[PDB]
Design a protein around this ligand. Structure first.
Ligand SMILES: [Cu+2]
Length: 105
């Protein structure tokens, strides 16, 4: 796999780690739809809305399996630690019109 998952379930926005690279989910979009990070960085998405959201990477992107992240309620967060360079497209499972990518270099 090209990322590790610190927590399989969401956690409170207040618990975001030092040095995490935050992507807000606000106004029904990933507010940073193209994020550039380095190997070893942890990206944390934070849902700021009442509607739940996740991040979903199809098979072959983060690794062999799809990664269907857990649904984040309002003011919850979810992280991925990227361990290899690449370009990692994702969408929101219930809202597939909501798309983003993480470029790891
Ligand atoms: Cu969504």
């Amino acid at each position: 796999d090209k990322a590790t998952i610190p927590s399989e379930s969401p956690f409170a926005a207040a618990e975001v780690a030092d040095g995490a690279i935050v992507v807000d989910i606000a106004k029904m979009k990933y507010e940073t739809p193209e994020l550039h990070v380095k190997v070893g960085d942890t990206v944390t998405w934070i849902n700021r809305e009442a509607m739940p959201h996740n991040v979903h990477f199809v098979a072959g992107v983060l690794g062999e399996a799809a990664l269907k992240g857990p649904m984040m309620k309002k003011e919850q967060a979810y992280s991925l630690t990227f361990t290899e360079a690449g370009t990692y497209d994702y969408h929101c499972t219930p809202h597939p019109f909501q798309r983003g990518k993480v470029v790891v270099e």
